[PDB]
Write a protein that binds this DNA or RNA. Structure first.
Ligand SMILES: [Mg+2]
Ligand SMILES: [Mg+2]
Ligand SMILES: [Mg+2]
Ligand SMILES: [Mg+2]
Ligand SMILES: [Mg+2]
Ligand SMILES: [Mg+2]
Ligand SMILES: [Mg+2]
Ligand SMILES: [Mg+2]
Ligand SMILES: [Mg+2]
Ligand SMILES: [Mg+2]
Ligand SMILES: [Mg+2]
Ligand SMILES: [Mg+2]
Ligand SMILES: [Mg+2]
Ligand SMILES: [Mg+2]
Ligand SMILES: [Zn+2]
Lengths: 220, 97, 57, 99, 135, 108, 113
RNA sequence: UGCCAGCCACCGCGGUCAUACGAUUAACCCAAAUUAAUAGAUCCACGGCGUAAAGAGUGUUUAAGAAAAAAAAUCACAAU
């Protein structure tokens, strides 16, 4: 009992514990096109702070803020993975469907990229099974449905006390998402980037978990 | 102290504003050729903006000009003067297909 | 009270609380004040807050 | 360290300026029979139709010449709050990565 | 159970407080992690109100003096004969060269546009680029 | 076992069914709370009223608010709140002064 | 429900022997073909609907297939598509699409329905 | 007893199986008082005025008031 408390509480004292600082740069995000938004016409009203400014009608995210945010997001993701809990990626976006499953399957994490049945998280035990565990963390690579409303899962995760980490875009509404990352959802370099990053954070959390378990076993 | 920030200048790439075919021309009721250019040949109708494609002020100008040309009788009402049927055609109408 | 823009001054409490009492000699008091100027500014307030205190007492 | 603002100021997407009638280089990453989906790198891909000249020359991975019309396709419509996105940009096909 | 109210406050609020009332007997994971590293703003719900009247946005449009030059460049020659690449992070276009030459002839202390523009054009002529010269 | 429930409003509600003519539903609005500051309410509706009492119970545990109490009895400061054609106003009392309220609000 | 399948298959075999020994056949070469004749002669129901006639069959043909346990004893689900609510479908879909993609990278009326 | 005889402050009850009538039987609540009646105390709006009761058919001024700075530019042309 004592040493398990030790194993879980130890990583919280170190801001870097999974050492993700090196996993990207502002240059990196810059070549992954993250800094591009939609036309100023399609902008949401709640992106006004996260934006940098309008270049000839096209809006541009603040990459400094992107890094500050994404850091915290990835850190969070990791600390959940290490603590051995469910992670569910979600996107409706078609171009990237395959990626996101192919990503998630390799993380030992789950994706839901599909039509999203309505009562899914809200009414779990009826939909999924007689009693069931629910995603510990939900992670959106797009915040939208193909009809350009907010994906149900946002309202629902938020409804269920699940934390949420997702990429807001200039048109999207950030406000219900626990940890946002402002950034471009549309360009494939960007999706790929975010994919592989959450992938890696997961992998490192899992490895580090295994390790500290082995050390736990030598100490005993 | 950041010299690489953006400047609060006006838009340099700004496209010059479009012009009615008459912008700063002079519409007189005296040149019936000009006024004939904006009238339907068979009717003697006056084409609307959505055909002529003129500014507000130039449409209005043309219209009044025409009506003047009709009452003073430099120009007829119910048909385009034949002399001017063979002149350059400005408007976007396709009658004959 | 609801209407009025500084309704606290249509109270009874605000009226009792203002303190000036006048000597027995005072009979008339004449406030001449000015609408437009920065240098009028104080005087105006006096009319708007304090005059209704004064009178009550 | 580079400040983000600096990265922005010196980027090609900035240098290009207005989108109309720009001559751009692009790459074909996906194909449906007549239609070739071209990333020129901007944000959204544009779409094209395979020309009659040398049909089989344009394939997945091929590079292409584009005349960029609009960086993206958008307009506001009757009784709309936000404008409507096609999630594509408008471009024309010139020749294929003329080398 | 718990509290499904999406409007009331952040998940942090509801969860912390429902535990505080000892209704929720099991502290959830993300909770502790959250306490450790909270996000910038609490994830609280906001009606997305429309703007009326005189209210505009806070966005600053993005312009450089480089652009005030480029305007004139495109005003003369058009888009560069070399085309463009958005894949190559270091790409310099005909335009950018022109801007540089013009910056150096500005550091040469010439205030007249004709001189600046034309001589920069001569520098790029000496660099072997083809200037189409469209009216 | 800590949660008390009280029925706030039971009401007979009707509908128009092509088949049946009128169709009679019961809807009960019900609140729940443990006395320790967390509480909530829900609506529930069914043909047979017993069924509906049940429904509101269970649905109401799903929406709980934490209600912060000063020194564990009063509210913190006065609240004047207009909500949809109904105005609520509530003053914060000292200790000997028990619950002076609309009967519903007493219950809650 | 799996304990039911174990039990039922056991009792099915024990009753199989029991059937052969009374019907007087070698328990080894006894087939379903023989099972049918057997019951049909023992419990002769004239009935038109043929499912309501007596049956002794291997529980697998009797009972429907079941969906297996979808999560470990930790609560954690095995398949990554579980939260789609149809994993079975979208797995076929993921695989099919994968096959397609690989075909695209690699590539550079018999009475069949 | 059967839309009759009757009752109710409001909603209402009596048309054959009335806890609403009349009478029993139990209860309830007041109590040297109890009900009924009629007058009071109390009771609107510091709320409203598109659809609910309510912005006058229109302008200017008197009486009476309210007041930081900006507050006359032009017909896109059909006042009288
Ligand atoms: Mg009778
Ligand atoms: Mg009777
Ligand atoms: Mg009665
Ligand atoms: Mg009686
Ligand atoms: Mg008495
Ligand atoms: Mg009152
Ligand atoms: Mg109103
Ligand atoms: Mg009315
Ligand atoms: Mg009246
Ligand atoms: Mg009026
Ligand atoms: Mg009047
Ligand atoms: Mg009238
Ligand atoms: Mg006066
Ligand atoms: Mg004023
Ligand atoms: Zn004009």
């Amino acid at each position: 009992n004592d040493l398990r408390d030790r194993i879980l509480s130890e990583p919280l004292k170190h801001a870097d514990f999974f050492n993700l600082k090196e996993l990207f740069s502002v240059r990196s995000l810059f070549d992954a096109r993250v800094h591009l938004g939609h036309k100023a016409g399609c902008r949401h009203r709640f992106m006004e702070p996260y934006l940098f400014g309008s270049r000839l009608g096209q809006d541009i995210i603040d990459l400094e803020q992107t890094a500050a945010h994404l850091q915290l997001a990835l850190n969070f993701t990791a600390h959940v993975a290490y603590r051995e809990g469910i992670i569910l990626f979600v996107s409706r976006h078609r171009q990237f469907a395959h990626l996101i499953e192919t990503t998630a399957r390799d993380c030992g994490e789950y994706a839901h990229t599909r039509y999203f049945k309505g009562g899914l998280l809200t009414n779990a035990p009826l939909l999924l099974g007689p009693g069931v565990r629910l995603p510990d963390l939900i992670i959106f690579l797009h915040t939208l449905n193909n009809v350009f409303e907010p994906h149900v899962a946002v309202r629902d995760a938020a409804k269920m006390n699940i934390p949420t980490v997702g990429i807001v875009d200039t048109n999207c509404n950030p406000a219900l998402i626990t940890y946002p990352v402002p950034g471009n959802d549309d360009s494939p370099p960007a999706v790929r980037l975010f994919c592989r990053l959450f992938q890696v954070a997961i992998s490192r959390a899992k490895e580090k978990r295994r390790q500290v378990e082995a050390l736990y076993r030598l100490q005993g | 102290s950041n010299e690489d920030l953006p400047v609060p200048m006006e838009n340099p790439y700004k496209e010059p504003l479009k012009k009615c075919i008459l912008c700063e021309k002079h519409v007189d009721y005296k040149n019936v050729q000009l006024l004939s250019q904006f009238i339907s040949p068979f009717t003697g109708c006056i084409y609307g903006r959505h055909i002529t494609g003129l500014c507000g002020k130039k449409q209005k100008e043309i219209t009044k000009a025409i009506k003047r040309a009709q009452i003073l009788g430099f120009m007829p009402v119910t048909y385009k003067d034949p002399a001017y049927l063979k002149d350059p055609k400005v408007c976007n109408i396709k009658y004959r297909e | 009270p609801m209407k009025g823009r500084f309704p606290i001054r249509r109270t009874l409490q605000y009226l009792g609380q203002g303190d000036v009492v006048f000597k027995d000699s005072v009979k008339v008091m004449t406030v001449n004040y000015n609408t437009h100027g920065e240098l009028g500014e104080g005087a105006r307030k006096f009319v708007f807050f304090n005059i209704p205190q004064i009178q009550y007492k | 360290v580079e400040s983000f603002a600096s990265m922005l100021r010196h980027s090609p997407l900035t240098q290009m300026g207005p989108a109309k009638n720009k001559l751009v280089i692009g790459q074909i990453f996906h194909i449906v029979e007549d239609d070739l989906y071209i990333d020129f790198g901007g944000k959204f891909h544009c779409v094209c139709k395979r020309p009659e000249v040398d049909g089989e020359k344009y394939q997945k991975g091929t590079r292409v010449r584009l005349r960029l019309l609009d960086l993206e396709l958008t307009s506001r419509f009757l009784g709309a709050t936000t404008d409507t996105t096609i999630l594509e940009a408008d471009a024309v096909l010139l020749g294929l990565q003329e080398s | 159970a718990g509290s499904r109210l999406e409007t009331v406050g952040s998940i942090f609020s509801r969860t912390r407080d429902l535990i505080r009332a000892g209704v929720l007997k099991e502290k959830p994971l993300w909770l502790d992690i959250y306490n450790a590293f909270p996000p910038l703003r609490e994830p609280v719900f906001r009606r997305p109100r429309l703007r009326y009247g005189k209210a505009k946005a806070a966005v600053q449009d993005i312009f450089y003096h480089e652009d005030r030059i480029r305007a004139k460049f495109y005003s003369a020659y058009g888009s560069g004969p070399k085309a463009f690449d958005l894949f190559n992070p270091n790409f310099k276009s005909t335009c950018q060269r022109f801007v540089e030459k013009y910056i150096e002839l500005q550091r040469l202390g010439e205030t007249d546009e004709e001189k600046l523009f034309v001589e920069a054009g001569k520098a790029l002529l000496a660099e072997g680029v083809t200037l189409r010269r469209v009216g | 076992d800590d949660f008390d429930t009280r029925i706030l409003e039971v009401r007979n509600v009707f509908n128009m069914t092509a088949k049946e003519g009128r169709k009679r539903s019961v809807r009960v609005l019900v609140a729940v709370g443990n006395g320790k500051g967390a509480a909530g309410f829900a609506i529930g509706k069914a043909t047979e009223r017993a069924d509906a009492f049940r429904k509101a119970k269970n649905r109401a545990v799903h929406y709980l608010h934490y209600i912060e109490r000063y020194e564990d009895h009063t509210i913190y400061h006065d609240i004047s709140l207009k909500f949809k054609r109904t105005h609520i106003k509530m003053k914060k009392q000292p200790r000997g002064y028990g619950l002076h309220c609309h009967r519903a609000i007493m219950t809650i | 429900t799996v304990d039911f399948i174990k039990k039922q298959i056991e009792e099915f075999n024990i009753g199989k022997r029991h059937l052969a020994n009374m019907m007087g056949e070698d328990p080894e070469t006894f087939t379903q073909e023989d099972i049918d004749r057997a019951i049909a002669y023992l419990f002769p129901s004239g009935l038109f609907e043929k499912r309501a006639r007596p049956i002794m069959k291997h529980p697998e043909e009797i009972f429907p297939k079941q969906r297996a346990i979808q999560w470990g004893e930790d609560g954690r689900p095995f398949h990554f598509l579980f939260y789609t609510g149809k994993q079975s479908y979208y797995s076929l879909m993921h695989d099919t699409y994968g096959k397609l993609l690989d075909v695209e990278k690699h590539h550079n009326p018999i009475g069949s329905r």
